[PDB]
């Protein structure tokens, strides 16, 4: 796929390469959809890290037409499916990878276009989960002020997306549900750039967008009792360890080497080996 870029990031856009991309989207989706039969060799070599930037920079120039918007939608499910299998894959670095996906997707997310909107916004929700925002071009400016400005840039975008939503029923309910999850994600991810811009949401004209946002303000407040979970929920006393053989018979073998670690790590601390 790296052959398709002519000179200094000039994309060729041939029909054969576009067809090859349309094939390889389904190929990557079907490969990443499987969860069994050995995940240890899913590590690879610079896993999909160079792959996706090339893929999105190809498909962004493809334009607005039916096959193009279809390939764009399929890529939007592919990013979400890949983001589901984060723990299996291995990047050398992923933060500025993730930020570049956010930049290369949010620019063009905004009849089948409104279908692509909730196809893509879910992928943005998946990408934004726990991601610390950082300026990729941190040179030329202070990093924390640029972080705050970037938070405002992504935050007002979700504001005027929710405002366009607030002006048929089920897809608008899908927008008004999925946007506030994105709100909660990028506010819970980083707060020191978040709160001073985001505290004005508590007086919003839409009531339903308030409390759940305000729910986030609860969690952060206790962001900064599990011993009974290690006690009665983990050991299962006065029996011949029924929940232990339950989790033995339920958990798949691919995490058994993890599972074999996590049982005896507990019980030698509680002296019931």
């Amino acid at each position: 796929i790296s052959k398709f870029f002519d000179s200094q990031g000039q994309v060729l856009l041939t029909d054969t390469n576009t067809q090859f991309v349309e094939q390889t989207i389904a190929i990557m989706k079907n490969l990443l959809d499987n969860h069994t039969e050995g995940s240890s060799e899913h590590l690879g070599q610079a896993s999909i890290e160079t792959m996706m930037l090339n893929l999105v920079r190809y498909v962004r120039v493809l334009g607005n037409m039916v096959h193009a918007i279809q390939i764009k939608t399929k890529l939007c499910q592919l990013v979400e499916v890949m983001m589901a299998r984060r723990d299996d894959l291995s990047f050398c670095q992923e933060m500025k990878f993730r930020n570049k996906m956010v930049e290369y997707l949010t620019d063009w997310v905004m009849c089948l276009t409104r279908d692509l909107d909730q196809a893509s916004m879910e992928a943005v929700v998946s990408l934004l989960a726990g991601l610390p925002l950082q300026p990729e071009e941190g040179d030329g400016v202070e990093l924390m002020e640029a972080k705050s400005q970037l938070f405002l840039k992504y935050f007002t975008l979700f504001m005027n997306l929710l405002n366009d939503c607030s002006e048929m029923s089920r897809r608008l309910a899908s927008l008004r549900h999925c946007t506030v999850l994105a709100m909660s994600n990028l506010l819970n991810a980083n707060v020191d750039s978040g709160l001073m811009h985001s505290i004005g949401l508590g007086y919003h004209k839409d009531l339903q967008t308030r409390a759940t946002f305000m729910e986030v303000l609860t969690k952060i407040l206790q962001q900064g009792f599990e011993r009974l979970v290690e006690l009665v929920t983990m050991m299962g006393d006065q029996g011949e360890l029924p929940i232990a053989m339950a989790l033995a018979n339920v958990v798949p073998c691919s995490q058994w080497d993890e599972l074999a670690r996590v049982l005896v790590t507990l019980f030698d601390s509680r002296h019931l080996l």
Binding site: Q93, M95, P132, M144, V191, D192, L195, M196, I199, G202, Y203, L207, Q208, R210, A211, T212, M214, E215, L217, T218, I220, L221, Q222
Partner: protein, 465 residues
């Protein structure tokens, strides 16, 4: 940037290479911690096959520079055993109260260092010269500059749960509280030395003739010290304070230090006409009174799925009146942004807002004339905004001038600034303007609290003209 955090530097008296770790240069985080541990892995790799020593410069190490527990657990597993066994000495310079609390919180992970002879705590800067030559010392220049030009006040007492004998060294960039008696850090009796840089000292307070209070940014608990020369320490810290903010700069908001804003967002939404908002606001107020440790008359709990009545007004008032009497330290920002939420709410909620803010208005008399001009200007901003809401809300007018203005006139010593606000807001409107007329009308309701003072002040300010 990670190269200056940890670097190979110098050779000790015992012939071991010395690695300097500057903790204050490290910022806690995923990629910063990963780059740090990879830089330590790359730099240590030629030298952990040989005996080596490490200087840990713990000057100004705070919550921004901690190791997370998953990251701190990595330091005992990712290196080989002879890497740990080849460490001849760990020179720990400038241990402080935060580092002591951090090691007390992580006694399980740091039990390999607890009681260890290999830890040499540098409680005095001349002691590090007992194992490393001065030409081989490569501590950062800021660390050496923290030792120079120190105005030292010995025999002070830091008052706390346990009052500790300390000495206060005030330098042109920082304040160092060095413990004069040893405390236990990792099983060793050491001399602590807290360091507070330029960017942390917020408030400088002189409580009395032999006590003062220093306030540290992003630290809720104030520091109080007892000394014979507290006024000299106060004027010296004000001198260096005036030095650094008038030289170096020629709005960053943390989630902690906005209690009034969150409290008002809780209380105004607690009486709202929707059960989901009302349910979530109750849990938020319960969490808010759990974290900040402020008194309620009754206990609280956070449970999802409660059914809360459509009115809460007596409950809401019984809360917002109890806090205002129990703790007055947060009235300002609460009253500041409460008026904005009043201004952009529906009228039925607007009736609630004055009804529950009228006890908070009774105790800003102490926040006037207390010799800090910024808060005294903030009070004038609040009263101007109260004038604006009295002008704009013609419909609710007898209730507001019965509630808040009479309560204002009931208390003494606030009468000057309300009359100056009246005069300078009367001058802007001009005679015949509504802005002058209805506020002149509210002067009557103001005067009914104390007759003589309002009469004397109006007549005197008139006769001087």
């Amino acid at each position: 940037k990670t190269l200056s955090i940890f670097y190979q530097a110098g050779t000790s008296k015992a012939g071991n290479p010395i690695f300097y770790y500057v903790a204050r240069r490290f910022k806690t985080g995923q990629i910063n911690g990963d780059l740090l541990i990879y830089h330590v892995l790359l730099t240590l790799k030629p030298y952990y096959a040989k005996p080596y020593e490490i200087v840990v410069d713990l000057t100004h190490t705070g919550p921004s520079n901690r190791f997370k527990t998953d990251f701190l657990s990595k330091w005992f597993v990712v290196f080989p055993g002879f890497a740990y066994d080849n460490v001849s000495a760990v020179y720990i310079y400038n241990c402080n109260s935060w580092v002591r609390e951090y090691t007390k919180y992580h006694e399980r992970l740091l039990t390999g260092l607890k009681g260890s002879k290999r830890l040499v705590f540098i409680d005095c800067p001349g002691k590090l010269a007992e194992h490393i030559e001065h030409e081989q010392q490569k501590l950062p220049a800021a660390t050496l500059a923290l030792e120079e030009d120190l105005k030292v006040f010995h025999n002070a007492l830091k008052l706390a749960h346990k009052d500790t004998k300390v000495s206060i060294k005030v330098g042109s960039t920082a304040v160092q509280v060095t413990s004069a008696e040893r405390t236990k850090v990792l099983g060793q009796s050491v001399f602590l030395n807290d360091i507070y840089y330029a960017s942390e000292i917020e408030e400088i307070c002189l409580v009395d003739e032999n006590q003062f209070t220093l306030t540290i940014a992003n630290q809720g608990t104030p520091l109080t010290f007892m000394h014979q020369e507290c006024e000299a320490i106060v004027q010296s810290i004000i001198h260096i304070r005036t030095r650094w903010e008038l030289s170096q700069p020629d709005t960053k908001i943390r989630p902690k230090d906005v209690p009034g804003t969150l409290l008002n967002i809780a209380l105004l939404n607690l009486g709202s006409s929707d059960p989901s908002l009302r349910s979530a606001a109750y849990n938020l107020l319960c969490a808010l009174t759990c974290t900040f440790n402020l008194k309620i008359e009754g206990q609280l709990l956070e449970t999802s799925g409660l059914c809360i009545p459509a009115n809460n007004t007596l409950f809401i008032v019984s809360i917002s009146k109890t806090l205002a009497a129990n703790e007055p330290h947060l009235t300002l920002e609460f009253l500041e942004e409460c008026i904005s939420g009043f201004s952009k709410s529906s009228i039925e909620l607007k009736h609630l807002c004055l009804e529950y803010m009228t006890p908070w208005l009774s105790n800003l008399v102490r926040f006037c004339k207390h010799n800090d001009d910024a808060k005294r200007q903030r009070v004038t901003a609040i009263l101007d905004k109260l004038i604006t809401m009295t002008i704009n809300e013609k419909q609710m007018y007898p209730s507001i001038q019965a509630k808040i203005w009479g309560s204002l006139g009931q208390i003494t010593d606030l009468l000057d600034v309300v009359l100056d606000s009246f005069i300078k807001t009367s001058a802007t409107g001009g005679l015949g303007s509504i802005k002058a007329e209805v506020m002149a009308d509210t002067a009557v309701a103001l005067a009914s609290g104390n007759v003589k003072l309002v009469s004397s002040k109006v007549i005197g300010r008139m006769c001087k003209i």
